[PDB]
Amino acid sequence: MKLSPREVEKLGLHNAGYLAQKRLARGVRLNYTEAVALIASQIMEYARDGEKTVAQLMCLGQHLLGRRQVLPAVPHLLNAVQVEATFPDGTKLVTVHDPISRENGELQEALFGSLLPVPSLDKFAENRIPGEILCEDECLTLNIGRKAVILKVTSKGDRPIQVGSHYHFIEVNPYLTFDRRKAYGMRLNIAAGTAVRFEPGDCKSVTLVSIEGNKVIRGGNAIADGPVNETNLEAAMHAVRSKGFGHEEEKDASEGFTKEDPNCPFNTFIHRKEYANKYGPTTGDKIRLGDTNLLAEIEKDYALYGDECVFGGGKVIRDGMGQSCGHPPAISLDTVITNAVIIDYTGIIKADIGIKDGLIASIGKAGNPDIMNGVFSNMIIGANTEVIAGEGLIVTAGAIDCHVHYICPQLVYEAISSGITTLVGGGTGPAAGTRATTCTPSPTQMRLMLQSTDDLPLNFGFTGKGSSSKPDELHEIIKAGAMGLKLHEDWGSTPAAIDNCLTIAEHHDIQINIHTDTLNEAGFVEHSIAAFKGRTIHTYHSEGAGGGHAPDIIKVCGIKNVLPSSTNPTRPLTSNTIDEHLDMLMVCHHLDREIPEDLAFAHSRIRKKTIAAEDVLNDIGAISIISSDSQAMGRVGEVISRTWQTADKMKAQTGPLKCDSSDNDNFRIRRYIAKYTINPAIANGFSQYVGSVEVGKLADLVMWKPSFFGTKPEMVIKGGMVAWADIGDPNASIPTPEPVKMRPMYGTLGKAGGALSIAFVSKAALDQRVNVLYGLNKRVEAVSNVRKLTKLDMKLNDALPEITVDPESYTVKADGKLLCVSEATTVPLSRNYFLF
Amino acid sequence: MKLSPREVEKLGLHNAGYLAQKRLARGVRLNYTEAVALIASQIMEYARDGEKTVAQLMCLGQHLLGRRQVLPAVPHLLNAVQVEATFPDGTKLVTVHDPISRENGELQEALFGSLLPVPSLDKFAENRIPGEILCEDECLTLNIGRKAVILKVTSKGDRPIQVGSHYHFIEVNPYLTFDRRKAYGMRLNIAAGTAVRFEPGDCKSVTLVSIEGNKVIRGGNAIADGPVNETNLEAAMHAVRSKGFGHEEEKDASEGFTKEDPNCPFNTFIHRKEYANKYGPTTGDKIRLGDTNLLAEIEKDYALYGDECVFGGGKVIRDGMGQSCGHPPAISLDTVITNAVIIDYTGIIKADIGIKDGLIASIGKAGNPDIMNGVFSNMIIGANTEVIAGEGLIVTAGAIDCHVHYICPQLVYEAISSGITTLVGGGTGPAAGTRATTCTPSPTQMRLMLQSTDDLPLNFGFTGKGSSSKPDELHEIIKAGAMGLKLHEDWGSTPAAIDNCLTIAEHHDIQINIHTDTLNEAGFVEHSIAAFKGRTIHTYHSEGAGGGHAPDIIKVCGIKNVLPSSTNPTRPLTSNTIDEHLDMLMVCHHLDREIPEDLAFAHSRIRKKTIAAEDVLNDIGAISIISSDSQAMGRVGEVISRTWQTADKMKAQTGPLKCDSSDNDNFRIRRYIAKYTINPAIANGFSQYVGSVEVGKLADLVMWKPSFFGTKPEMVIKGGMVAWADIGDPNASIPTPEPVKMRPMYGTLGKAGGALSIAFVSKAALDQRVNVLYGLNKRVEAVSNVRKLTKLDMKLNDALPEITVDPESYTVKADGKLLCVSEATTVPLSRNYFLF
Numbered sequence A, B: 001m002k003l004s005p006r007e008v009e010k011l012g013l014h015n016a017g018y019l020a021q022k023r024l025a026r027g028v029r030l031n032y033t034e035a036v037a038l039i040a041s042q043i044m045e046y047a048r049d050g051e052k053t054v055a056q057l058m059c060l061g062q063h064l065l066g067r068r069q070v071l072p073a074v075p076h077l078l079n080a081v082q083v084e085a086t087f088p089d090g091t092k093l094v095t096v097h098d099p100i101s102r103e104n105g106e107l108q109e110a111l112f113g114s115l116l117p118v119p120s121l122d123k124f125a126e127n128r129i130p131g132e133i134l135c136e137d138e139c140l141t142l143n144i145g146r147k148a149v150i151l152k153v154t155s156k157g158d159r160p161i162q163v164g165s166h167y168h169f170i171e172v173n174p175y176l177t178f179d180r181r182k183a184y185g186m187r188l189n190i191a192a193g194t195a196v197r198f199e200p201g202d203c204k205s206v207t208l209v210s211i212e213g214n215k216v217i218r219g220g221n222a223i224a225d226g227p228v229n230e231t232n233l234e235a236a237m238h239a240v241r242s243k244g245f246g247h248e249e250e251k252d253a254s255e256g257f258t259k260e261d262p263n264c265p266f267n268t269f270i271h272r273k274e275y276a277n278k279y280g281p282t283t284g285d286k287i288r289l290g291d292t293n294l295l296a297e298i299e300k301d302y303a304l305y306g307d308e309c310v311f312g313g314g315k316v317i318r319d320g321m322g323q324s325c326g327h328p329p330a331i332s333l334d335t336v337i338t339n340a341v342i343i344d345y346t347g348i349i350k351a352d353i354g355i356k357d358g359l360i361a362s363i364g365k366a367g368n369p370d371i372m373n374g375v376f377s378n379m380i381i382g383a384n385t386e387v388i389a390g391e392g393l394i395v396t397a398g399a400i401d402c403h404v405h406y407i408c409p410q411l412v413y414e415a416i417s418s419g420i421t422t423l424v425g426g427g428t429g430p431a432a433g434t435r436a437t438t439c440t441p442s443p444t445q446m447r448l449m450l451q452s453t454d455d456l457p458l459n460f461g462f463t464g465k466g467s468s469s470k471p472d473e474l475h476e477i478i479k480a481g482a483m484g485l486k487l488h489e490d491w492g493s494t495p496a497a498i499d500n501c502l503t504i505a506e507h508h509d510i511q512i513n514i515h516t517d518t519l520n521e522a523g524f525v526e527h528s529i530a531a532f533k534g535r536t537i538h539t540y541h542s543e544g545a546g547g548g549h550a551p552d553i554i555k556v557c558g559i560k561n562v563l564p565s566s567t568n569p570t571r572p573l574t575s576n577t578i579d580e581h582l583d584m585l586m587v588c589h590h591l592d593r594e595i596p597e598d599l600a601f602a603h604s605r606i607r608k609k610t611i612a613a614e615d616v617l618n619d620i621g622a623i624s625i626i627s628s629d630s631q632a633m634g635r636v637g638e639v640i641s642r643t644w645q646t647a648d649k650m651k652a653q654t655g656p657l658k659c660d661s662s663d664n665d666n667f668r669i670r671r672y673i674a675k676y677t678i679n680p681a682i683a684n685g686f687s688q689y690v691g692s693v694e695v696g697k698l699a700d701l702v703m704w705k706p707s708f709f710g711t712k713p714e715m716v717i718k719g720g721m722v723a724w725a726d727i728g729d730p731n732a733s734i735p736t737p738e739p740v741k742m743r744p745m746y747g748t749l750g751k752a753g754g755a756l757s758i759a760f761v762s763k764a765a766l767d768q769r770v771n772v773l774y775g776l777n778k779r780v781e782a783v784s785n786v787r788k789l790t791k792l793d794m795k796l797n798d799a800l801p802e803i804t805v806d807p808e809s810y811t812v813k814a815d816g817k818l819l820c821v822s823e824a825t826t827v828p829l830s831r832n833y834f835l836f
C-alpha cells in the first residue's frame, strides 16, 4: 500500500465518519464529535468520486445534517468543518461554513458511499449555549484621555493602501496625502487590530489619537524616529519634504480630546458583544463554563480599552507599535499570552500573561511602554517575544492529580491531554502492589521511575510504602527520592504503622497519605484518628467507597489535622453510581455475590448515603481536593471534568452558595478549581512552584475554549513551552483540518520535557543530590512545609463540620443536620463531547 | 473532533467489534478475541443509545453470544468482558460476567447498531479446556505441627470487624472480647489470605494456631510487641487491661496441636481444587499448556501450606505479618513474585521468586522469618518490597532469539510483546544485505546500532560479516563490538572463508553462525564439514529450507562440533508448509516458474522429507535451538509458539517420549523450552547472565495465564522491572477494561531500558571500553566460553544420530532408520487466539 502517515490518519477519520453514519442511520441525534467526523468524511468521499469542485462541496457540506439530526448544542458548537482530500487536480482544502443550516439534512448525501439504508426523517426523536458570553447591552469607549484630530486622507497611489490601528500615522505610505504635521505622534482611533483601507483615489476622513506612554516613535519609514517633541517634529517635517511623502496642510482640521462622552465626535465606540468577539470578555461580562450551569463573571480587567495586544497581519504587535523597539534585550518577555480570561482560586480576571525563563513573570497589561500607558517593565513585548493568542479563551493552572497509581505510561498521556501537568502518587508499573496502592517501594524502583519519567513534560512526585512499624526502611525510600509515603490497608494500616509513619514524616517534612482499615480489624475510625496524635495527614478517598473504615471514615472531614481528598468515580452521585461501584468492588476484591459475608462486606463499603454526603461536603468546602485513583478505582482523564460535574450538580440541586453573588457563580467556581490546583500543591509541599496562575510560579498553563471548558482543552503549556495541543492533519495547508486530535508537541521530544519540569523529592534526597546520582535532566526540588498544615490551610475548602454517621443506617449528619442530595440522572461535560 | 487518546482507542475497539459482527453475520463461530471485541463494542453502543442502565447492560451482555456462535474453547476462556462508556450520567464501567450463558444468543442484540442482516441460527456449523488444572480429589491440611486453641470470640462493637489469616490475634480491635492470654502468639487457622467476619454482637468460635519462625510479634496495636515469651506475655496482658481491650478468661477452651490427621478438630483443610484457585497448583497437580495437548506436572513446591504469600486487603503481606518488620533494610527484596509455577529446563516447580538489584536473588519460600518457618534471609519481604502476584500463572525465562535480522525496529516491539527479551543477530535496517543476512558489516554501523538500541529494554548482540578469506577486517568488526560473525552464502560460504572465520573465532572467543553453500558451488556438505576442522560452529536453519547445501545440509545434526538450530516457519510440517515455502523462496530469489533450472533449484531446496525429518530431529533432541529468521524467512513473534506447536504435533503423532512419565509431558516440555532459553545463551556465550530461571541471573521473566501459554503473555519483566504488559483503557477505573492490548511500560521510557539490560560484545571490544567510546547507558558484558562447546553441551538436546540423506529421493534416516512424520492439518496456539 505504501501508506504515508496522512493516509493512515485519514483512514481513522473515515472510520469515525462511518460510525457516525451507522448511528445516524438508526436515528441517533449526533453529537458535535460525530457530526464533524461525518461531514469531514463525506467531503473526502465526494472528492474521491471526482465529480464535484471545492466550491460545490463548500455548499454540499451544509446540507448533510439538519438541526433534527444533531443534539441541541451542535449548531452552537459547530461553526465550521475543514478537511483536505485528493481531488482530480490534487490535494485541496474544503471548509464547510455553518454546516447545520436546515431543519432536516439530505440524508442520502449524509450517507453517500456508506451503503447504509437512509432513515425516514421521523426516526429522529424530538437547550443552553455552551460557553456563551453574556454582556450588558452597551458601548465601551476607546482610547479615552488623548489628544485627537480629524484629518482628510487622500490616496494618490495606484494600488490599495491599508493602515493598522497602531501604526504611527506620519510613517504611512508616501502616496497618502494629508496633514503630516497634525499626524505626528498620532495613530488611528479605531478598534485595536483593525485597519482603514484606501483604494486608489479614495478620500476618507479619519480620527487620530495621540500615542501615549513615553511617546516615542520608532520604525515605519524612519520619518519621525524619536521621542515626540518640537525638535523631532521639525526634523520629521524636513524628512517628509525631502523624501516626497504626501503632505498638505489642513489648517481647519477639527482638534480636541477623547473622553467619556457618548456625543464627542472624536470618540470611537465598540459594543460589548463585538468587544468580546475580538478580545474576549471584560469586566462584568459572564461566561458559561462548558455546557454546565455555572457562570463566571470577569471581576477586573487590566486592559486599557483600545490598546489591546492582538497579533496578526496589520495588527498591534508589530515593530515600534505594540512590540517595543529599544528596551534592554534581557527584559523582553519570552512569551506573552494575550487577552486571557484567567480562572484561578485567586480570582476570575482578564489580563495578559508574561512568561520568562519558564516562569509566570507578570500578569497584567502587556505591550510597548513607548506608545501605551500602563505597561510595567516586566510586561514588555520585544523582538524576541513569542505570542500565544488568548483572546476568547480561558486560561487555568495545570491540574495536579495527587492520587496517581503509576500502573502504565499511557495514563500519563491521558492525564496531560486532559489538562493535568503534575502527578503525585506511587507505583512501578502494573505489578499487583501498584495496582492496589500508590507505592514505589524499593529504592531501586524509585531510581528507575525517576529515570523512566525524566523526559516526560510533567512534574512528578513518587511516594513510598509507609506501612511499617519501624522507621528504618522508611528512611531509605525517602533518601532515595520519595516525597511522601502511603499507608494502605493492603500493606497494613494499623495504629502501630500509622504512628511510626507519622513520626517519620515529622522528621522528614513530607506528607503522609492514608487509605485506612476498612475491615476495622485493629480498630474503628476513632482509633486511627487517635493514632494520628494530632499530626498532619492526607486522607485519600475520604468518603470511603475507594477504601476506609466502614461505614464511617468520612468522619475525618471534620478533623482539624486532616487534609481530606475525594477520588473521582463517585463524583457526583448519579443514577448508575451504586450499581457500578458495587460491581467494581466485587471485581477488584474477587468477591462472590452468592456468599453472604462477601456481599455484606460490599454493602458496608459502597453506600449511597455517604456518597451523597460527599457531594455536599465537597460543595461546602469540607473536602479540599479531588484526585483520580488512576486505574485503581478512578479515572486519570476525569479529575477536572468530575470536579465541574460535582459543582454543576450541587448548583442545580441547592442553588448559589451562601457566599455566592446571584449574578454569578464565582465563589463556587473558585472553591472547586482549588480542589485540583492549589490544594494538592499545598498538601504535598510544593505550592511555591505550581498550583496557581501567580507570578513567580512555573508557567504550567492550560488554554480552553469556553464551550469546551472542563472537558477538552486546546493547548497545554508546560514550563512556558507547548507540551500537548489540538492539531489536525499534519500534511494540511493549515493546522485545523480533520482529524483534529490532542497530540504531543515539541515539549515531548528529546530531553525538552526535563527542561520544562520538576521532579519533587524529599529534602533528604536532595541533600545527597539524587538528581546527580541518577543522571536526571529534569530539575529537582525538595518538598517542604507540610507538617504544620491543618484543614484551615486548604484554600476555600477549610470547613470543619462535626460529622456523625449512624453505624446501622449510614445516615450522615454535619453539625447535627442531615446531609442529603438526590442522585442526578445526567451530568454535563459528557454526552455533548465524547465519541464513546 | 478534538479526539482524546481514549476516543481514538475506543474507535479501534469498535472497529474490531464490527469485524466480529460481520463475521457473525455470515455464520462464523467467533474466537475468544472476536467475542470480547463484539461484546465490549455492543455495551458501548447501548450506552450511546442512552436507554439502558449499567445494571441492565450487565444482563444484556450475557445474551449476545451463545455457545453455538463461538468456538468450543470460548466459554472456557471468557470469564468476563469489561468496558467503559459515556452514559447520560457520565463514564461508567460495565462488567459482563460469564457472557456465554445460553445455547444461542439474541443475535439482533449482538448486531444492534451494525445495520447488518441477522443470520438464522442454522448458519452456525456444528473440545479441551485450555490451561486446565488437573488435581487429585483430596484435601490438604493447613498449618501442621503447631500449637492450637479454640476460642469463643464476641463482638461488642457497633460496626463490623473482619480479621485476616495472619493478623496477630491479641492485637485485634478492642471491641472483640475473648481470652487474650490464650490468643497471645497465635493467629487464625484459616486459608492464607482469607478472613473471619464479626457483625456487631456476633459470637463465633475460632481456631487459632501459633505463629512460627522466630515467633516475634510486631505491629497491630503494639499490645504485644516483641518475641513470644513469658515476660512479654505478662507485659501484653498488662497492656490489654490498661488500654481496655476486651478480655475474658476462657479456662476450659480446647487446646492441642495440628498434625496430619483428618479427624483432628483443630485442623483446617482445603481441597486441591480450591487451593489451586487461590494459590495456583501444587505438587502432583497438572496444567495444560495453552490449548495444546501438553500437560506439565508440578514436581515440587516450596510452600508450607497455610503460609502462602498473598497480597491484598486483609491478606498475608502486611506489616508485622507476611511483611517483615525489623530485618536490615539492605536485605529486603526489591520485588517478590508470589506463588509462581516456574517452567524451565531445570524443572517444573512451584515457588516464590525474589528479585534484588535486577537479579533473581532467590527461588523458594518467601515471607517473614518472624512468623513463618522456612524463610531464608535472602527471601525476606520488607517495607521496601514490591509484589507481583504469580498465583495461578506460569513464569518462564524471557526467550532468546538468536537468528534476528535487524530489518526494522518494529520487529523488536513484536518480539518483546511475544515474550522475547534477548535478540542476537545482525543488520543495519532494511538494506539488501540485512534483508538477506544477519550481518552488521561496518564498525560505523556497529556503533550506530548499539547507540540506536541503547534505550530499548532488551539484551542485544550484533554479529558481523564473517564471509572473508582474510582475518584483517574481521578483527576490526569484532573490536568494534561484534559478539559473533555470520558466514552466509550470499557473501560467500566457501571453505576458504569458513576456515578463516573459524580461526578468528578461536582467537576471539565468539560464536560463528553459518548459512552454507546451497548451490554446492565450492563443495558438497562434507566439504564444508571438513572446513570446520572440528571447531565449534552454530548452523542456522539446519534443515535447509532457510538455506544450505542441497539437499543434505541436515546431516550437520549428527556432527559433534555443530550446534544446530531450526528457524520457525517450517515448524512443524503442516498442510500448507510446502506450497507456502516454495512460493516464498521463488519470491525471495526472483525465480521464474516457467524456467526449468529455476524450478529445479526451488524443488532442491524446499523438501517435504527434510522438513518432516526436522520435526523428528527436534523431538529427539538432535536440533538444539529454535529461532526466528525475522522478516528473512521467519517470524519474530512466533519463536515461542512454533516451538510449542512442534512439541504438540510430535506428542500427537508419536505419544510420550521414552524419557517421559506417562502421567505428564515434563521431559518433552523441558527439552523444548531449552530450545529458546538456555541453549541460545550457551551457544552465544552469555548463559551466566540469562537463559533460565536460576539464582544470580538477570530477572528477565515472562508471566503467562496457562490458558494463553505459548501465545500471548500477560507481562514481560526485564531486569526486574515491567517492560511490556497487557493493559486496557488508560482512562478506565481499573486496568482491565477494553481494549486490552500488549503495551510498553515504564521500562521503555527515558533511559530506563538501558538500566535493565545488557549489550553483549566481544572481549576485544570490552577491552577498549566500547561502551564508553560509544556513550552507551546499557550495561555491556563480553561473551565467553564458546570455543570448546559441542552438541553435548546443548541442554536436553544433545543427540548425535548418524544422518543420511538420499541424494535423489531426499529420504532421511537417523542411525539407519527412516525419519518420517505426516503433515498436520491443524496446530494449536493459533485459531483460538488471533484476530487475523
Ligand code: NA
Binding pocket: A823, A824, A825, A826
Ligand atoms: Na438529575
Ligand code: NA
Binding pocket: A550, A551, A807, A808, B158, B159, B160
Ligand atoms: Na455497621
Ligand code: NA
Binding pocket: B550, B551, B807, B808
Ligand atoms: Na540431488
Ligand code: NA
Binding pocket: B823, B824, B825, B826
Ligand atoms: Na493433523
Ligand code: NI
Binding pocket: A515, A540, A541, A546, A547
Ligand atoms: Ni485507596
Ligand code: NI
Binding pocket: A403, A405, A436, A437, A438, A629, A632, A633
Ligand atoms: Ni488508590
Ligand code: NI
Binding pocket: B515, B540, B541, B546, B547
Ligand atoms: Ni540463512
Ligand code: NI
Binding pocket: B403, B405, B436, B437, B438, B629, B632, B633
Ligand atoms: Ni537469516
